[PDB]
Design a protein around this ligand. Structure first.
Ligand code: B12
Ligand SMILES: Nc1ncnc2c1ncn2[C@@H]1O[C@H](CSCC[C@H](N)C(=O)O)[C@@H](O)[C@H]1O
Length: 576
């Protein structure tokens, strides 16, 4: 027996979808297609009734994202078996609308996209996923090729915002009318209103997450709301476009010269930077077993729309149960991935003699410090400050003109070069659950590798904190000496400098990890950055800089003032 196996066929479907039961979806939907006069009645019928149940169930707080994707696995697997019958008997089945989704050119991270997409499919909307590093050309060409009502763009890094504005300007040059939805971690409501919208006659809507998205595609794609929604979006996008537009960013900029005279104050003659126990470039690798203990699960829960900090989240009266099951699954997969060695985290680390020179860091070939093998550039905050200094990462390395011997470190790690293969496999068998799982887990593994390696550097490779012994909780709170800023973050926005790290460490040749034109890393599950030992070194944002630094930086980088303005776009204190 089973009780639910004694219910109506289209009732067992609703049950299997909601509960995510896969075992009987095959030999249960084939029976429902017989009752129906055509293949599209099962999809448009019981198959969607259940998803409609998942939808309100979800909206009430009795169901969460992790479970929802599990329902999709049953649906998408029901369609898969029922697609040979549909096409071989025509009819494209009624849908709520079509959409072309893709990760901007140059970018590579797509976890958030995969989520937005799956959720939309759970609302019958049809989604065509072009993947990542997709050229604006194929994007607009695909949307036309298969008549799409909406185009969705994703972007993780700053350089993506440029390619986005590009897509909008092209949609205008080509006459597109359909709405443009821009989302991602790099996308904000202010940028969409101040830099994206105005370049397109059609609607342009920014949407935080994958839940309020189905709500936008709903009103924006309807008839009784479509018009009112755009007008509201426009007005608002103006009260903000003119909000930021003028009423000038109160916080008077400063001469790059004055900033430099306010550089971090420190008596270097009295201080002696720890000497690295080791110098050189080392190919590193850690097992999943060693890295699990360094994993910070909080961001992992965020990724699945489960609010709460680990481990307290496991006891939450609302999502604790589901967080537990999601946690158990992740660990189940790690056990397999580790035992089979199907996913292998790897990286490279390096320490070099170094000294500051202006706002940059010279890196020497050896301890004689006679030959400079490379330069780390870095930018300086260009804002008036009282009580504080105009920070520049270089400031934390001993000045060349101090005679003090200092150093600088670099690293590049990835959760595994197999991330993509693995994702594709699940992608094949229409398993969105662990397709997302494996990538989210590869990401945790990468960040875990960065925490582990930073510890090894502090305790061994660099060796200034050999006796240091912190708990994972203690590591996450960064209650240790030194920092590891990563190109792209606030204190070092210029993404191009990742080239410096890749040159010093010869990353690609050593690990396989790659770099794109937009300077995104591959695999997606990968991290890279620097290492500073100074006990006074901390994170901060370079924020908005002026024309003077853009030019000085241009000279130093050997780039046009034009090229550097594109790369520091989000940090420019003036207009483009
Ligand atoms: C841990 C984390 C990571 C992860 C894993 C999870 C992830 N990305 O989703 C990993 C380890 C891969 C990572 C690394 C890097 N990161 Co990171 N990361 C973070 C952090 C702390 C959390 C983001 C998170 O977990 N997102 C949750 C996921 C599920 O959400 P999401 O991607 O944003 O997607 C949601 C929505 O935005 C939406 N959406 C997504 N796409 C679309 C598309 C459409 C069309 C629509 C309608 C909606 C929509 O739907 C999603 C589900 O709700 C943030 C800070 C922050 N809070 O934003 C930075 C942040 C994204 N990282 C940043 C940077 C700099 C980097 C690195 C280059 C760092 C380095 N190592 O040098 C690399 C990129 C690696 C590469 N391959 O190129 C930046 C800045 C962007 C910039 N200036 O380029 C951020 C904002 C940090 C900051 N404060 O400056 N990242
Ligand atoms: N202002 C800043 N400038 C440069 N890098 C920064 C920064 N703020 C954060 N970072 C980088 O991002 C890291 C924090 S995010 C990584 C740890 C987090 N618990 C997780 O698992 O996702 C910092 O350690 C540093 O590597």
């Amino acid at each position: 027996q089973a009780e639910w196996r004694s219910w109506e066929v289209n009732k067992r479907l609703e049950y299997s979808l909601v509960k995510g039961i896969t075992e009987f979806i095959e030999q249960d939907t084939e029976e429902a297609r017989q009752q129906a006069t055509r293949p599209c009645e099962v999809i448009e019928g019981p198959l969607m009734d259940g998803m409609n149940v998942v939808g309100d169930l979800f909206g009430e707080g009795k169901m969460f994202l992790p479970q929802v994707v599990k329902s999709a696995r049953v649906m998408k697997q029901a369609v898969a078996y029922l697609e040979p019958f549909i096409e071989a008997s025509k009819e494209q089945c009624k849908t709520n609308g079509k959409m072309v989704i893709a990760t901007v050119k140059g970018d590579v991270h797509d976890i958030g996209k995969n989520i937005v997409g799956v959720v939309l499919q759970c609302n019958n909307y049809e989604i065509v996923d072009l993947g990542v590093m997709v050229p604006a050309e194929k994007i607009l060409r695909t949307a036309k090729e298969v008549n799409a009502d909406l185009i969705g763009l994703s972007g993780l890094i700053t350089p993506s915002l440029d390619e986005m504005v590009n897509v909008a300007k092209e949609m205008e040059r080509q006459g597109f009318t359909i709405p443009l939805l821009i989302g991602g971690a790099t996308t904000s409501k202010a940028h969409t209103a101040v830099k994206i919208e105005q370049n397109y006659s059609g609607p342009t809507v920014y949407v935080q997450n994958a839940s309020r998205t189905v709500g936008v595609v709903a009103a924006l794609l309807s008839d009784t709301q479509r018009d009112d929604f755009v007008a509201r979006t426009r007005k608002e996008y103006e009260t903000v476009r003119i909000q930021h537009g003028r009423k000038k960013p109160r916080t008077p900029p400063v001469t790059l010269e004055a900033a430099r005279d306010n550089d971090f104050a420190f008596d270097w003659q009295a201080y002696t930077p720890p000497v690295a126990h080791r110098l050189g470039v080392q190919e590193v690798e850690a097992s999943i077993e060693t890295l699990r203990n360094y994993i910070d699960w909080t961001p992992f829960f965020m990724t699945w729309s489960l609010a709460g900090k680990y481990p307290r989240i496991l006891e939450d009266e609302v999502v604790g149960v589901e967080a537990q099951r999601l946690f158990k699954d992740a660990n189940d997969m790690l056990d397999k991935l580790s035992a089979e060695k199907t996913l292998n985290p790897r990286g490279v680390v390096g320490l070099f003699p170094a000294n500051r020179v202006g706002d940059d860091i010279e890196i020497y070939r050896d301890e004689t410090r006679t030959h400079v093998i490379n330069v780390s550039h870095h930018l300086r905050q260009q804002t008036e400050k009282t009580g504080f200094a105009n920070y520049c990462l270089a400031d934390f390395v001993a000045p060349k003109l101090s005679g003090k011997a200092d150093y600088i470190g670099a690293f590049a790690v990835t959760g595994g070069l197999e991330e993509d293969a693995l994702a594709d496999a699940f992608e094949a068998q229409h398993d969105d659950y662990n397709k997302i799982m494996v990538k989210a887990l590869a990401d945790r593994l990468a960040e875990a590798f960065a925490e582990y390696l930073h510890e090894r550097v502090r305790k061994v490779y660099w060796g200034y904190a050999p006796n240091e012994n912190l708990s994972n909780e203690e590591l996450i709170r960064e209650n240790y000496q030194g920092i590891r800023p990563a190109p792209g973050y606030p204190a070092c926005p210029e993404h191009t400098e990742k080239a410096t790290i890749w040159e010093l460490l010869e990353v690609e040749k050593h690990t396989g990890m790659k770099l794109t034109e937009s300077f995104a890393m591959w695999p997606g599950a990968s991290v890279s950055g620097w290492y500073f030992s100074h006990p006074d070194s901390k994170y901060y944002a370079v924020a908005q800089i002026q024309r003077d630094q853009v030019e000085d930086y241009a000279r130093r980088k050997g780039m046009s003032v034009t090229e550097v303005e594109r790369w520091l776009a989000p940090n420019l204190g003036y207009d483009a």
